[PDB]
Amino acid sequence: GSNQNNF
C-alpha cells in the first residue's frame, strides 16, 4: 500500500 509521513 501507499504511505505518507508528515513530520
Ligand SMILES: [Zn+2]
Ligand atoms: Zn505498501
